[PDB]
Symmetry: D3
Amino acid sequence: ANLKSLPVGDKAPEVVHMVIEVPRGSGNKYEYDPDLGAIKLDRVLPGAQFYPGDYGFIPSTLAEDGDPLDGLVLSTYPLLPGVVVEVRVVGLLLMEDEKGGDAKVIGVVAEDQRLDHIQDIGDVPEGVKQEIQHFFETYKALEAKKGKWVKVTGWRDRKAALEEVRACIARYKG
Amino acid sequence: ANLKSLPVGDKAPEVVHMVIEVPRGSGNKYEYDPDLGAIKLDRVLPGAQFYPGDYGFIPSTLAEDGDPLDGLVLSTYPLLPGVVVEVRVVGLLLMEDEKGGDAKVIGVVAEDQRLDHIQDIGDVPEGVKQEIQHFFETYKALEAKKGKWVKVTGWRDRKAALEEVRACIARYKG
Amino acid sequence: ANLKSLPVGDKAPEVVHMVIEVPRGSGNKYEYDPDLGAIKLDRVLPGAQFYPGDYGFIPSTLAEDGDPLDGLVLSTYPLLPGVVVEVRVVGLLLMEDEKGGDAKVIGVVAEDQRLDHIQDIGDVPEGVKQEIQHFFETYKALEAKKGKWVKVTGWRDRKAALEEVRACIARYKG
Amino acid sequence: ANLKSLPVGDKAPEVVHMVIEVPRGSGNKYEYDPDLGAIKLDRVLPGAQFYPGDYGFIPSTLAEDGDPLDGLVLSTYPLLPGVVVEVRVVGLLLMEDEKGGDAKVIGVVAEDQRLDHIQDIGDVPEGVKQEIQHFFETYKALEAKKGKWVKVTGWRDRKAALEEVRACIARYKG
Amino acid sequence: ANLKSLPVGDKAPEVVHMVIEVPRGSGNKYEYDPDLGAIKLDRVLPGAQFYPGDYGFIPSTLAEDGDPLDGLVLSTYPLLPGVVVEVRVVGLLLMEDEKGGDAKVIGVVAEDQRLDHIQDIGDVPEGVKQEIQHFFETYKALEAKKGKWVKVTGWRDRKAALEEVRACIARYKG
Amino acid sequence: ANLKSLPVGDKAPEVVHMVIEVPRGSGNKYEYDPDLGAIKLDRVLPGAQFYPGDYGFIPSTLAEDGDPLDGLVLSTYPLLPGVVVEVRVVGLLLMEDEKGGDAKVIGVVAEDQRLDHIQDIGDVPEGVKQEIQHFFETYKALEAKKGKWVKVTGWRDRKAALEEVRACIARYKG
């Protein structure tokens, strides 16, 4: 259709719809292209790395950067590009990249009983939070000479995330 | 498009079109959502299980339960969500679930020479039929407290299946 | 949408858009069906084989055989059916099949730094070129009794490929 | 060598050596055979299931049943049959099987920072504990007619587990 | 230990021990090396192929070619190099290779209920037998210039296979 | 046996024996333990990374650090822990780690026709060399607080590597 304009979901902002672009464990950086109306390969990560969780965007949201709000989902099994999943929001990852400031939503697959226990950011084990941060700090390292860069600023809890979700939802309506 | 309304196929009812929702070997229960027009994750199975064959529905059919007729396909290699495959009908799996009675079609990938020998239900090895039944009898066991349940009634041959296919085809035209 | 009519790309003919039908390493021969508007399974290869690279077609091109121009991509990680990737053209594989003459484009994922060194056909290692040829010469061997056949004629360099790309692009406009 | 007689480890009983027999996610039930001195396939699970964690035994221990003490490990990535890993003991799974009473040790890979947070049984999410229990209650269901059976009695904490580890260690020395 | 001298098994010749060298689905041609006492990589198949079933040898047997008797096993899930599995003998594959005449045993994993129905060669579906034959006729095709070759002579039933098993068992005792 | 004392091979130093410890694509850092005589898990890498090639050691060699000479192999398909493979030496990776100076051998699977073209370090594509270096510079980043560190010094050609191989071979004899 036009995945970027799917409804954000009825349980929003606590539980939102997310379009998965990159499965967890993948080094193939895919993206949904509204113009082509299909998933395109943006690039293959240059280092021996993979996304630490499933990556996608929240449909019908607009970040301050003009794109929908992005997020990383903790899943039991990696998802596939282009599928829609209800995600429970538990936190934010703040970072500064080439382009500017940025905040990514941290969520868990809402319909997986194995994760019912992750309700706030303090619930994501720190071994996992360190893996995520280290990913974002090195994954664009081989693309420096291409002017890409990233710095991780810090983490925020479920209350802060919901406020950002709400604001990107409003902004999209505008 | 709208996968639920694709043509059932020219060789129907003997050979029908099927939209695959869940690959064999997957614990990610996906479903096609006509309203969203995309594959959505309905849920992750709570137990350490996986679909014993590829699961999907027959487009342009309507079961007595108001949904298209569902079915399980025996394949050499697991398929992917959202692909269309011609399936040869060889039997029925009768079951009673929370909601009510139900019959699933048992089929084989029509264009795979390794399976040309499976022509009727008596051709599906019983080690395989037991695996299928045991799947449907335990997979919703951890979702009891959520009011889900299932009981397997029995198996039917290719003649019975064709009659149900024909009837759900008619009913869809209505 | 209609993947066959997506734009061929701005960097064409040197760098073109390709719709992936079969991932590298797959024995599931998928194809995009414009009529159904979905990926369908054409068949499962009968032998214990898999595509030596990702297979798909160039959108908005028309070969002399009336279909878009087909091609094989060298990738670091197998792609998925239905995704669009920018491919750098480095050569041609000429062959004669049941139906007739045929030329397939040989390309590399354009946005993968691990492959930046493959710029012409002479850059594809010959151990790899032999694997490709042997694939096309035996993969339809079990489908002879079904009147399918193939013979590999030879390889052509990036200059020849570009000329064919350009010609199938023109022809599509017609 | 003789994996059953490897040292239990210096940090025992808190951290013990474990010989992995079945990787997590596997349906191939392997076992180490001291007599043959190799990993043998005991059987393929009859249902569409897989071990919910890596399964193996503690070397140089003897349970009341005459075999070494068995255990299930929570890992980030499945292990391989025959490798030795240091496992941190956090709990016990009590069960009754055909043969008799039984207690399995629940542990986590000791050298994986992503799991440093699992220190006692109350730390294993209950969605995970339910998956484990349901596995042991249904996995031998298709082997009933072969006189196999299992009932899960309950869970015990790290203090109880250590006591059993210590006792099977002593008993082995005997 | 010395896998080549493990016991052939108590249920021999009907059910024999087999040391798996190459998992089904693998292109890595491993072999057990008695001299090194370890699994070594003999070579990577040059074509885009994989073993159609798990390959290994029967311990304590000696073929007319001076090596133990080789065989191909039909399994539900690929096995791993160096594991021992009880295999039920159902047939023979006769072939002529560079070196000479040769007969491979065709078997099924004995302890997998999904295969209990394969009791003689006539039970291996012909789509499967064609895949096996085509494998052996093309897999050494890229190694011709290295003087390797193979021709498949025909298939034999469980009675013929047992006779060969018995004879290679006797011969080993010698 | 004792993998550390296997023969280095007859074609040494040009082609050497290597015991694989970590498959390419793995995050499970295994090691052969002579004392236990088995493969043990040393640790799970803390970041979302994997070895860029298969890692192991050359048997019957002794580096200046008292351990056998280590190396990274370029393979078509990842290998398994504990298998022996003949590796063709094409270069050296010099680095400084916590402990001290270090040089790793860079090799290719000798019996894989797809790699026959990699004969010297200048033949390893630079997209690949950058991936390797970036791996070694970040993989121990989350283990800093554990006093681990690494710096990559540079690369050396096949002539330099052979000299180091020869020297570690001599030293082992001592």
